[PDB]
Each structure stands twice: as structure tokens, then as C-alpha cells.
């Protein structure tokens, strides 16, 4: 936290944040959502961290360097220590990236090492080579060298992600699954876990061993698991919540913007809301059925009339405002909704479904007031526009995630937020063997395009290929893009440090401070 001069801080330096759902885990190797990451950035610190404007900055590494984007050398600060006063060494990173890669860990993010293209990643994941073969090395206790198979200029960018955070050899080996229990956890971020009560709260407290302890202002932070955006908003209104989750209820939003307008933050967010189709199950394995659903959805109504929070209607997976994206708007998007509907009617007919002999399927959503509102609207539009019968089902956040991965669904509400600001953050998720591939989409052609991005002679060449890769997904109608998110949440007047200027929303509680009020 960098407290301005004019600022007169409060006595109690504590914060309460809504975290949207009960997290999958606190183990950095077992998580994949936004909620999990919120908490992780507070507890575990990797090589780099994001500053308040979302730019990669020194974390555990103080300085780093690369030899042609292929060999990267990280110089670890000598004062970095764990929760228990033990130092953070190069060896911690060696062990942690190995465990992430290890097929046994079954991390939903194992593929992250593939995205960075660390030497031998393929075979390890494949199980042909042991994780010990990873192209990572502790040169000495304070030197961590990374060897890649190709030149990746944006490599350092990936490093602020929790999956590449170090984990404690000791606790892990000693307690296994129970290592994250408060009595057993060892952390290296600004905070330590004080308390964890499932479906009630997670309470964090200042970690005095953090190398940057003198700049930490908030002594305690509480994370709540409230999935009802309305409840969040009520409780914030009561004055029990300082910063809500960044999902705003469609019901109250307009109200809010008029009564407490300085507390309503609405910033650009590098996320895409979409309806994911299980690509491997009949009849969704047919591109005509996929395309009809993509086309029959009326983005206009959903974005501008139903929701109405400032999101942008989407035509791609990768948000067009991502660093390095030069996208082409598809022709279907430039049409009239009735033109799209007619087209859509036709594709489905061709596929064998008409309003007389219709298609019926399940639309899965994670429990949420916002998501439920939308799914209803969407099911209505497809009924209206296509004569399809949609059956709504909802699951709990961690169950919802697991279903997606299992492929025991039809169509699901989905969202993907960038982990780094570069097109591959979105694109790598569609790789046939990607651990994050929950569309169950497999395109050799798509694979080859992405693969080619790391074999190019220059940067321009790179971006044309990313535009080509998006055209392919769209061709295949892998998904149904809906909108490009706005980051909209309520922040009490006394919370300092929340700029809203990081499109990744990678907030660190060590960066906020309470003002006298």
C-alpha cells in the first residue's frame, strides 16, 4: 500500500470482501476460478506480482533476465521468507512447478506450464518423462532458471498467476490434503490464514514475515462466499461489506447508480461471458446445431435490455481490447437479428429439428441471481427464435466446475478471464489437450495455428495468426459468445487503493487501506 499524503487512516485496519462462492481449494495447484485466485494472491507470492495498474512487477524475484526469450533467469530476494520464518528459495519453485506438472496432482492448470512452453512439458503431462525432467533449475538458493522449447517474449507475464506460486514442501509432504488447514498452512504472501469456516468465511491476517510487511496496512481481511448478488448488495448496504463481489444484480443496479453512485465502480474487464457447448456429445457435435444456437441468440436484448450494465456484445472468445488482438468481426454479426434467426432456423432444420420435431437440452448455470436472470432470458429467446426446449439446471460453484471438466452437460453458462494480457491467455484454453478445455473442443487446425504463433519470425505475423485462430473457433461455432464484461462492484468510500485500472482485476489486499470515516 502506497498511502498518499493527504490521507488520514482509520484505527481499525480491517476489510470485509464478498468472494462470490466458497472456493474449490486454498492449494494453488488445485484451483481455476476467480474466487480462488482472490484469496491466493493474498497468501502465496510467486516470481512476479501485478502492481495497481496490472503490470508485472517484482514479487519474490527482484530482477530477472532472458537469453533470447528462451532462457529466463530469476534473481530471488534474499529476505523472502515463509510464514514460519524459513526462507523462500529457488528450490521451492523447483519443487512447486514440478508438482504442478505432475499428472498425479491432477491440477486443472497443469496446462499452464505448456502455455509458457517450459522444456519437456509435453512428455511429463503425457507421463513419458518424470516431472523431474522439467526445464526449471535452482542455480543456487536465489537463482531460478527457466528453459523453454521456443522463444516466448511474454513469458514473464504469465508468472503472476497463482498456479505458478510456490507451495511448502514441508507442509505438503507432512499433511497432504490437510496442509491448507489453518493449523498446518505455511504461506509467503502478505497474509496468513487465521480462520476458515466452510460456507461462512475465510479470515486472513498480516504475515509479519512478509518481505514487504512494512508496506502492508490492512491487518485483517475477511472473504465471504455469497453467491446471491442481491444478498451481497444488501449486506454492503447494511454496512457489513466493504467491497462486494464484481457481479451486480440486474434488479438493483439502476437503483444503485442513482442512490450511491460514487460507490458504483464500472471498469473494463478482460473477461468474456459465453454459453459453452459440450463439443463431443450428440447432437452438439454437429456444427449446424452449434451455429444455429450462436446465431439465434439476440445479444442486443441480453446486453442492452436485460442486463444493461455496460457490457459489450461479443462476437469472439478473446476480447478485442486485449493487448495484441487485431480481430475481424464475422459477417453473421453484421447482419440483422431476423437474418441471423432465418439462417439459424435453416441450419437446425437441415440438422433434423423443426418447431414440430424440436431439440431439447439442459442449460447448466452456477447458482447465482445474475446467472439465473440471464439463463431465463436466453432460454426464452432460443424458444422464441428457434423452437428449442431448454431445461434449466443449477449447481454449486465447485460442483459446476467439476461437471464442466467431466463433460456431463449439454450447454453451460461460462466465463473466462485473462491470466495475462495477451491473446494466448484466451486461445490456449481451446487447445485439444488443454487442461482448461471444458468445451471438449478438438481442432487439429486450431492447434496448428496456435502452435505456429511460437514459430513466427516477427510480431505482426503473430497477431494475424491469432485473428486466424479466432476465425476457426467461430467457423466451428465452438461456443456462443454473449458479452465482453465490465468490472462492476460497490466499494465503500473509505477503501483506498482501488483504482479499477487493472483490466485483470488482480487486487492485493496489501495494497488497500482504510481512511478515517
Amino acid at each position: 500500500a502506497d498511502v498518499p499524503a493527504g490521507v488520514q487512516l482509520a484505527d481499525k485496519q480491517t476489510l470485509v470482501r464478498n468472494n462470490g462462492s466458497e472456493v474449490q481449494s486454498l492449494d494453488p495447484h488445485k484451483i481455476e476460478g476467480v474466487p480462488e485466485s482472490n484469496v491466493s494472491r493474498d497468501l502465496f507470492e510467486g516470481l512476479l506480482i501485478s502492481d495497481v495498474e496490472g503490470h508485472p512487477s517484482p514479487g519474490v524475484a527482484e530482477k530477472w533476465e532472458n537469453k533470447d526469450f528462451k532462457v529466463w533467469t530469476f534473481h530471488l530476494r534474499e529476505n523472502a521468507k515463509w510464514s514460519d520464518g524459513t526462507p523462500v528459495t529457488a528450490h521451492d519453485f523447483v519443487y512447486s512447478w514440478q508438482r504442478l506438472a505432475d499428472p498425479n496432482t491432477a491440477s486443472p492448470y497443469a496446462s499452464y506450464l505448456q502455455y509458457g512452453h517450459i522444456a519437456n512439458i509435453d512428455d511429463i503431462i503425457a507421463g513419458k518423462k518424470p516431472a523431474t525432467d522439467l526445464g526449471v533449475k535452482a542455480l543456487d538458493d536465489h537463482t531460478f532458471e527457466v528453459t523453454l522449447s521456443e522463444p516466448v517474449p511474454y513469458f514473464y507475464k504469465l508468472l503472476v498467476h497463482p498456479s505458478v506460486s510456490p507451495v511448502p514442501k514441508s507442509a505438503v509432504e507432512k499433511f497432504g490434503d490437510k496442509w491448507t488447514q489453518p493449523a498446518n498452512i505455511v504461506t509467503n504472501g502478505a497474509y496468513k490464514l487465521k480462520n476458515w469456516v466452510v460456507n461462512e468465511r475465510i479470515v486472513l491476517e498480516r504475515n509479519p514475515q512478509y518481505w514487504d510487511n512494512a508496506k502492508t496496512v490492512i491487518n485483517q481481511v475477511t472473504y465471504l462466499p455469497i453467491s446471491s448478488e442481491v444478498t451481497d448488495v444488501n449486506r454492503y448496504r447494511s454496512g457489513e461489506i466493504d467491497m462486494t463481489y464484481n457481479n451486480m444484480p440486474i434488479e438493483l443496479f439502476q437503483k444503485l447508480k442513482k442512490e450511491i453512485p460514487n460507490e458504483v465502480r464500472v471498469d473494463p474487464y478482460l473477461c468474456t461471458y459465453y454459453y459453452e457447448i459440450n463439443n463431443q456429445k450428440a447432437p452438439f457435435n454437429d456444427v449446424r446445431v452449434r451455429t444455429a444456437l450462436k446465431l439465434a441468440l439476440d445479444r442486443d436484448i441480453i446486453v442492452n435490455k436485460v442486463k444493461n450494465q455496460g457490457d459489450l456484445p461479443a462476437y469472439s472468445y478473446t476480447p478485442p481490447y486485449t493487448d495484441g488482438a487485431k480481430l475481424v468481426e464475422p459477417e453473421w454479426f453484421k447482419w440483422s437479428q431476423q437474418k441471423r434467426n432465418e439462417e439459424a432456423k435453416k441450419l437446425l432444420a437441415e440438422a433434423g429439428f423443426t418447431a414440430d420435431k424440436p431439440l431439447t437440452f439442459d442449460l447448466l448455470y452456477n447458482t447465482s441471481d445474475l446467472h439465473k436472470k440471464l439463463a431465463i432470458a436466453v432460454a426464452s429467446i432460443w424458444k422464441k427464435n428457434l423452437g428449442v426446449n431448454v431445461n434449466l439446471e443449477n449447481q454449486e460453484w465447485k460442483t459446476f466446475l467439476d461437471t464442466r471438466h467431466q463433460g456431463t452437460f449439454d450447454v453451460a453458462r461460462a466465463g473466462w478471464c485473462a491470466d495475462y494480457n495477451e491473446p494466448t491467455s484466451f486461445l490456449n484454453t481451446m487447445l485439444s489437450d488443454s487442461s482448461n478445455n471444458t468445451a471438449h473442443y478438438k481442432s487439429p487446425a486450431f492447434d496448428k495455428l496456435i502452435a505456429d504463433t511460437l514459430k513466427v519470425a516477427d510480431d505482426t505475423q503473430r497477431s494475424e495468426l491469432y485473428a486466424k485462430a479466432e476465425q476457426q473457433l467461430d467457423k466451428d461455432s465452438a461456443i456462443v459468445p454473449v458479452y465482453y464484461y465490465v468490472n462492476a462492484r460497490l466499494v465503500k468510500p473509505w477503501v483506498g487503493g482501488y483504482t479499477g485500472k487493472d483490466p485483470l482485476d488482480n487486487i492485493y489486499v496489501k495494497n488497500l487501506y482504510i481512511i478515517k470515516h
Binding site: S21, G33, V34, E36, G415, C417
Partner: peptide, 4 residues
Amino acid sequence: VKPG
């Protein structure tokens, strides 16, 4: 990451 997946958003809630």
C-alpha cells in the same frame, strides 16, 4: 481463470 473462470469467473463466478
